[model samples]
Target: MLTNLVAEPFAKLEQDFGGSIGVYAMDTGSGATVSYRAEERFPLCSSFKGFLAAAVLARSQQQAGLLDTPIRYGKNALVPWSPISEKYLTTGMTVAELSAAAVQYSDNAAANLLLKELGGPAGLTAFMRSIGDTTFRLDRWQLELNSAIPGDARDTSSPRAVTESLQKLTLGSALAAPQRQQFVDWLKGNTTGNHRIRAAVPADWAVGDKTGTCGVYGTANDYAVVWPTGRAPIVLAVYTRAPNKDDKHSEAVIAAAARLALEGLGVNG
Candidate 1:
């Protein structure tokens, strides 16, 4: 009864936005879940960077000094929206710095560079598979991946899959202790999602998230792990897409959906 009541608002929200919304939220303590269109695939967008960073950390475990290794790229390597990498074009940046930029700022060039190191899209897909995530697929590089062509499953994952894999990585044994904490820290520092899920959460609770904006089709996404005070953490994902090519994505819709998910989970914020 409560879950049904909680899910009632999402349909209204999507109707208002003229798009589809996917959400999957789980309370780690009770194992309760709130799911709405959670099995449907949605573009990963830059949100994949969070997992890409985790993939790098996974490699760091076997390859010592991997994170500290300095890498220099040419000016030609820079792409649109490559803010951090473009600034350090001449000086270059370390692997750790690139990972941080990718996660915190959604840096385009930095993500591509790291993607190259991981052997491109297929490589990252393999990494996700190794972690037992079958639904996660990365078929292209940045900028291109942001195309988010409707009906194209090129770069997508379902909300449930993203949330499940995230739980494994951040709160489970998929990563070593130090690397796990490092990944959490990088996510906690993400600067792009203030208007999305963060706006729905209470100020005192802790949150770490990665956001993705496709800049077309009203498609965008956010996946987050929230630590509510005096309670076990919660992990969730929110994804949106519209039928038209030029529709604008709404951060308010995402925030409202997140608030509903939390309410469904009984997390009073």
Candidate 2:
């Protein structure tokens, strides 16, 4: 009955956007959930960077001093949207810095650099499986992965899978306490997601998120962990895609869908 109520609003929002929207929101306290097309695959885009950072933290648990190691890359490593990593090209950055950049800024080159550390796309996917997330997959590197080609499954994960994995890594036992807090810190500092999930959340709530945009096919997404005062945190994912390649993604639609998910969960603004 609860899901049915939210379904109508989600459908109306998707219809207005002229695209498909996938959402999965879970209330950690009650274990209640609301899902809309949550099992359907959607382009991962830059959203994968968040999990990539978690994989790195997972590695750091066994490999001491791993996070502090400095990595210097050549000019060729810089990709188009690498705002933060590009600035550090000459001097290089620590593993921790790159991870933060990938999560907080969605720096393309920083992501590639860290992907190399984790043995590329397959390596990150392996990390996800290790954490029991079977629905997550990353088959290609950045720029190529961002293509968001309609039917290609090169880089995609279902909304439910993303949210579940996020809960494990952030609030469950997937990562050690220190590493887990660090991961949450990076996400809290994210500069790219203010217009998506964050916009729909109440200002008093503490939220952390990562945003992704494919720049075509109206493909984009945001996954977040939100803490309402005196309550358990909520983990959710919102993903969008349109049939037409030229279609533009809408932050507003993402925000509205997030609102509906919160409403469905009985979370007040």
Candidate 3:
């Protein structure tokens, strides 16, 4: 099922973008799977922020803390993003608000703040392990900023693991019921970055996910989750490092990939 949906799109992408492309997908229940170069480790880019959000929520529950706790934004804790100018976010925000921004807008400042709240990088990794994602790690918050060193270890995870995490969240297994509902609600509210995963789906087709972009000389990666009612939700992770920069081509490929994946799941158009 996975190969049939991905082959044509990946072939076209390879020809058009001239980059190394990788993809992975799996059913949340039956563990049905498919991929193209899925094992290749590529820079996770901002997608790591999803893991950060999960870690923070998990840690908060571990301490029996509340999500409504207000967190002040210190200068050192700030990171820059296109949507969030440094000057506009001088004030503090609550944990719930920052997590929403981090996942929805892919806000770097929100991510950095949440990382601090989660007790920094080491703490984040420890949380990942606790949650059964032993292969994932966060060496830095924002890759463009040298705020943190880029470890020789590139952020890595299989498409299966990504799908697994999404499934767990949707099932309310990874987090407590209240925390799960809150996280899922935030994901559903994501509105800023939708060019890739949500591009080809229907307007009513519910989707909750994070996107990662690392525009290098030869790479662009986009990944997301699609939640359609009464069916197993699909997790799509597409990673490409292009020899030439082509944002349109990248978006088109991801959209096509998503369309195919959804269709395979018996979603109409």
Candidate 4:
């Protein structure tokens, strides 16, 4: 039923957005999937932080009994868009707090700090592959937006890979059960911009996900699970890249794609 309605609109979207966009939708309980461009890989931007967060939690659970142990911040711990760094006050926050700030506020400084704490971006990539995400990779961490890296971009992943990881986290199937629950709890606290996944859904719908934006590439991406009342839950991941800077248009495209996906699934949009 869902596929019948979404096929044509997705084709139209492919035409409208010259750059590639991938989507994956599935039942959270059963893991039934309906996807478009599932295998294709694209830059992940800050969305990779979701993967990093899970890895950090997994490692923390192994080495330390507590996942919430506090760590102090140095000048190098700062990244772009961090109000904490702006204060110019030396302070410390727990791993959990830094993880929350990384996702909730999309703080680059916090993300880099977390990355360093998790043994650098190379180590993070290794952990993703170790956890069975073979298709995902991080080109680099903390590279300035304008600086050209060896690869076209620093971070990349496929919609299929991302949704699969999220599904594992949702079901507490990967990592320890306790650690998985901790990751979900952290995701629920995400307070960053909610425009994409939240754009076409009900106010009360429960969404656990992350979003990414790269001004250098004119790209905006979001991946999430939508929990609507009395309906089979669906996972949606959308990525858009415009040659010119048009974030608003990118968001509109995402909202349209989400509406199409949900309506196809028989959820009122």
Candidate 5:
């Protein structure tokens, strides 16, 4: 069932990956696309932080200057899993500041902080539906989720849903210019899994992405929007979930997929 676009090296990862792997890609300008197991849902981990970040920016514009509003964090919003939240214990942070931690650092507490600002899980899921995507889901808060922690890790999305979300949230015509730029800028600064999509390509090629990892059940997910200068930007999302906890393969599989796209399109630049 391998598509012509992802024939050899791509499917080769499936064997080495030893898990349910979903791969999806699309040319933003040409509308050419490909997918493997893209409809099956997999635990999203923290990849949805990028989605959460987008919602915050859009809502800020809707309410006018909401990004600058100060919101304090206490035990209520704190989750043991979030470094950013622990970093700012018992302190106040602006909506913009919290968003930076959420996307750039993959900070769970920062994500929950903004989630609370947006009215929790309902807020993000509602926004996802508003955008005309019902298959992808954000069913639980950050600290509350983990594969072994009981709950199917609650949050889930297919490769296509993640790619579509990235397209609409970034390249699509949803957010205003300033808001889009702000979110993109923060996304570019993201620090997790630098070796995933960005490192898989020519050194100068640019990639903007978010990464997610769950410890016990072995999950690593990344959804990326790549800019290759002379060609249409590539939208790729790779999800890998294994019973064993090894993030290295999860990260490498995504990079390998990106490398395939680069070679396939003849755009090393």
Candidate 6:
């Protein structure tokens, strides 16, 4: 089912967008899913990293310690964008560490390293398809400064499909229990979006979500399963793109939009 729960609030938040904002949000088991421009796709940025982790986790079931396997990447592969991997230039990191850096810190080097492990875009795309998502693409390296032509389409996905992928992963439909629980555990430790999606919640409330920001400016996205006392889990995904390149403003838009969504669902603290 669908409703105005998200329509009215999203309309208000989107009024300030210099570009566009796409949002898909729902309270699990609540029977209502609300969306706005959610059908449209945008360069998902780090949001696509979640899919990378998911696909890898799915494959891990076929190979043990897939999460803990030792792997190494050259410094040449490192980009200026990721603080997480840059710090690990001379070290060997496991799939677990790369996934953690990718999810928690949105680390581009680790993401690209894992992408390389998955055998690049074709392999990753095929993996996502097996689990049920088509919109998410892992085209370029984690930077806007890839070898592709200027202004080429970077990786992209829609809000609805992203949330759907998350729901499937969280429900353990696509992966076995080990990887499923590990994925959730890795996501719960996400240090990003602390002030965005969970901005309005009480200190004790539980919010575990992954944020996707297009570095210094442009896209801002959050996808996660939120738990609120006295209410079912809320699956909220907010995507924003601003032509103005004001990161702070775009971040505020996501936070405010999320707060409005929670209030609309009566998931107040």
For each candidate, what TM-score against the reference? 0.97, 0.97, 0.82, 0.85, 0.89, 0.88
Higher-ranked by TM-score: 2 or 3: 2
TM-score of 3: 0.82
Q: Pairing residues by index, what is the TM-score of model 1?
A: 0.97
For 68-143, candidate 3 gives per-residue lDDT tens digits of 7777665765555725525445666778777777887888888877777677777877776776766666665565
lDDT of the structure predicted as candidate 1: 0.94
**Per-model CA lDDT versus the true structure:** 0.94, 0.93, 0.64, 0.69, 0.75, 0.75
Candidate 6, residue 238: how far the Cα is off, in Å: 0.3
Q: What is the lDDT of residue 187 in candidate 4?
A: 68
| Candidate 2, 13-103: lDDT as tens digits | 8999999999999999988889999999999999999999999999999999999999999999997989998899999999999999999
Candidate 2 error regions (>4 Å): 1-8
Candidate 5 or 6, higher lDDT? 5
Model 5: what TM-score?
0.89
After superposition, the stretches of candidate 5 with alpha carbons farther than 4 Å from their true spots are: 1-6, 148-153, 244-249
Q: List, residue by residue over 1-269, the lDDT tens digit for candidate 5.
A: 22345353656676677766777778777676767777877888788889999999889877887988887767766666576767667667888888988898888778877887788887898988888888866767665455523236368878988888788878887788888888778878888868787777565766778998876555677888888778788888888776565434456777776667656544554
List the candidate 3 regions with Cα displacement exceeding 4 Å: 1-9, 75-77, 82-90, 144-152, 243-249, 264-266
**Cα lDDT tens digits for candidate 4, 107-164:** 7777787887778878888987776878777767765532222245457777888887
- Residue 150, model 4, lDDT: 22
Report the C-alpha lDDT of model 6 over 176-213, residue by residue, as the tens digit. 87788878887889888787787766777666678876
At residue 85, what lDDT does model 4 achieve? 38
Which residue pairs in model 3 clash with each other?
A: 218-241, 218-242, 219-241, 219-242
Clashing pairs in 4: 78-109, 79-109, 139-154
